Design a protein around this ligand. Sequence first.
Ligand code: ZHZ
Ligand code: ZHH
Lengths: 360, 360, 110, 122
Amino acid sequence: EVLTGGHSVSAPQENRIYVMDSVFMHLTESRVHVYDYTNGKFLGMVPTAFNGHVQVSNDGKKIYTMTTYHERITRGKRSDVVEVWDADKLTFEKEISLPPKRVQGLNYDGLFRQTTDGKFIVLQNASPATSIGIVDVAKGDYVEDVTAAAGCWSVIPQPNRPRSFMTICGDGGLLTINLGEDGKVASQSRSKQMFSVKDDPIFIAPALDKDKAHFVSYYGNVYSADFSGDEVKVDGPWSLLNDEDKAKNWVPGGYNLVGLHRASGRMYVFMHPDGKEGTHKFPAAEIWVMDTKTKQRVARIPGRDALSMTIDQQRNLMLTLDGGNVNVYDISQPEPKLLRTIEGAAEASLQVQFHPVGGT
Amino acid sequence: EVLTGGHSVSAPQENRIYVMDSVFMHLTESRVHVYDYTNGKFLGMVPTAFNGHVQVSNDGKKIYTMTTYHERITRGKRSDVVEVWDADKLTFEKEISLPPKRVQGLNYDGLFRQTTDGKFIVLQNASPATSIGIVDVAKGDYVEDVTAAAGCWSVIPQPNRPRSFMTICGDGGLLTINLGEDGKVASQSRSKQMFSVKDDPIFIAPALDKDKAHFVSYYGNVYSADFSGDEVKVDGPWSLLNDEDKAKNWVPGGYNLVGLHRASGRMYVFMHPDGKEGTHKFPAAEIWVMDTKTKQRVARIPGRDALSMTIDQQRNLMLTLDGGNVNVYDISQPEPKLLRTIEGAAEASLQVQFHPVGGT
Amino acid sequence: EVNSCDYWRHCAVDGFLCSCCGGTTTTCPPGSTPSPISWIGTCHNPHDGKDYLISYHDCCGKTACGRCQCNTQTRERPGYEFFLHNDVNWCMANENSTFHCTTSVLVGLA
Amino acid sequence: HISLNPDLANEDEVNSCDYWRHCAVDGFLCSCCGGTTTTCPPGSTPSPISWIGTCHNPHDGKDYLISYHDCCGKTACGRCQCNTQTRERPGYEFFLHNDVNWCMANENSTFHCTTSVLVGLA
Ligand SMILES: *NC(=O)Cc1ccc(OC)cc1
Ligand SMILES: *NCCc1ccc(OC)cc1
């Protein structure tokens, strides 16, 4: 026998998921764990140094990571980077230098995203002054800061436009940025106030449709941003809660805590009872399934202490994640059906993502 | 209130112990945890990157670490180093460059040592060819590479000479190296064969006296090396075992598995029953206390699943370590007395050391 | 009591309490460096019944302490209210951004 | 000869520290890490050097030389940690010794996982 390397991932792309393990107890050795969601098999991993973030290229060929190095880890010169990795070989290909201010923080989706056309990586900076960073994937270059986003946070791509995205600002409104072909800001616009920052703060995680996004609030309200037209139109609140729900103080809680099944308009949300100040990151007692057209709850199921989720539109699936274990659900009907749990997928993960299938 | 830095360790040097946590599950974030053995309090830590090794300077003023960096951790140029840290401020002071062959392996004491006079650090290399490297602490330089030690392993300092040490060689004998005041080899000698490599291999960990060292074997025999003269005189075996012990197949097991109390000549050894091929690293069922003069056991106590130990001569203490927890024993009398257990001192440690109090 | 996540001053700590890490509530463990910037919490004092501003400066430049992990969220808000937000590393602007532990520094009455 | 062919065996059997050929493994089995008994997980590199020794195959009753190459250049796999020590010896018998990183001479020495390559009859 002879030991060989150079091998590709054993399961096809359509079976793969990416569990971003922060390894908070040893945060300098964070990594992406690659699993087969169909059988729970561990397929491989990508090392991501200190507090890595991850996404998969829209075309499914590459894995993008974002991380921070120092020459001697705890001392020496800082290098913030995006890395491009081959998805099938799980090998490093290219480092793209960033200014030394990429966001260091928990793995919300909106901190490290890409334009719909896949041509630009769009990431959150904090020095602690905030701006959005743009990386030109073709060139392997950092373009420049989107300084217009100062005082705002996180990136919500507009799936109906090639290189546009939104961010949530301290004024309770949304800023929309439209990039030119060079990755610089070509135009921008600012919505009216969507939510009261003081009285009804929203979670940053979008329930994202092709031409609109919904957001849930600390008190269980829903806000919407419609970007089908020239400028963003905002509305809300509508309540997730009926009187019985309110009587038991049900509110949302989690991190990547919502999802939208675009074909049906079903929105998925982690919820817990006995809400009060300080419970907004509590694990899910339940998952609620809302029809966003009728504004009614259509299902409620046990939460399995989940904190984060993700939805696959192409296979009609929802994954949930409690920090260590990944639950796989079939959401082709209003009531989700639990298929399996992948135990020990991570030590400290708040983000799981599917390998993209299709999506043009 | 104002947050301040710049503080020194809050307990006196004489209370401090050093638990080298390999953090094998995340071995790029190994570290030294500093504890107060008198009360179990966590005092601070020193980060040691990939598979760090540690020792405290014989004068008690500095902590030395040995580790490996790469420019991008899992890729890029390698740098093997010794670092000098202040013992009281737990701050980095200087880096000493090593050739890229320092031993990467579990934390046996003998892989990273110093001369009795404290002027030279003496470390094991493996490329995989073995040699012993000499670092001049004052100059901050790697000054000698002892290729005479090829095929040998580990460093046993001679406490009765300023710059002399021994190593265990593939012939079953010992090579003695005497360094000059420049850290270059000034002379050397080779003992007669002490043990049969094939028939009665010894554990590398010495039970070290001022002028002699004892070693235990896989089958429970004891070998000795007397270095009261320039030429080392070797003898053994004598058995740790009586007939009853042999009936239950008692043998030694562990890593840093022996210790010597110099004032009394008592040798401490981790032992377990039902020994056979493959059990040499098993946790201790018992600690046996041997009188090295009469060559007989005097006491036996529960082993608490310990794997490694260390002795403080002047306070008459023994620490034992099971990988995660540190037990503190009073060995002022022949039967050790358990004083306390420090739970959760490490995730994966096979080495604990006292702060030196004896000076140079 | 200061080493417990339920100690009143720790009401918006996401991290390891420095007091379990060889430091104290207001001092960094040896060889770790204070952050000049922080998130702020408003915590209720159970003795005098008053609310106080607590500044959660991190200690930085050493790897994770690992002891007394807390994740309390009283009055914590998302990153669009950035200095009330505790899901970011407040070591982000230090010479070395590696996160060691979190302190709970009393600023004064809210 | 299923006992000699891990890829034909039950995965639960080869992924166990008690599998006969893993008799001197200190590390994470590569077959639990996205590789197999004789292939590195994607993006990790075989070590050109290894510790070696013999393991008894209880299925065919014969003794075999095993070579315990590591896969390198990725951080710790974390899965199926073993610490078996049959015929393992200290560093003065260096190529029989398993308390050292056999990735030590790789372009990147970070240890990912270890395995047990069948060389031949002892
Ligand atoms: N098979 C070995 O390479 C595993 C191993 C043992 C000790 C190491 O350093 C602490 C690394 C890898
Ligand atoms: N005080 C905040 C501690 C913290 C939170 C998150 C993070 O990024 C993963 C680092 C440090």
